[PDB]
């Protein structure tokens, strides 16, 4: 909180998770793959839409 009020520079703090090397948040991990010709840009389009 005392670290927002700061510029245009995002500064976070956080406690390490339990077991460093492992499956943090109960969160999800989601990778968008590419599949054909679509390029960086097209994916960037999907990326954003989603």
């Amino acid at each position: 909180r005392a670290f927002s009020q700061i510029k245009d520079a995002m500064v976070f703090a956080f406690n390490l998770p339990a077991i460093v090397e492992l499956g943090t948040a109960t969160g999800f991990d989601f990778e968008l793959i590419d599949q054909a010709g679509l390029g960086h840009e097209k994916l960037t389009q999907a990326r954003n839409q989603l």
């Binding site: 590419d34 054909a36 010709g37 390029g39 960086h40």
Partner: protein, 50 residues
């Protein structure tokens, strides 16, 4: 008469072999050998039978 892969170009982001070799018709019987000359250091077009 033997290919020579040069380097890689890219197809639609997907790195890729590139090769220099003779169209078909100017390599099938050994009489074709003579279609081939070869600059020497006077700029002379030398051929093979030389």
């Amino acid at each position: 008469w033997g290919g020579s892969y040069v380097n890689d170009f890219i197809d639609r982001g997907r790195v890729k072999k590139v090769y220099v070799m003779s169209e078909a018709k100017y390599r099938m019987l050994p009489d074709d050998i003579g279609d081939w000359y070869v600059r020497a250091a006077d700029g002379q077009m030398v051929p093979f039978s030389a």
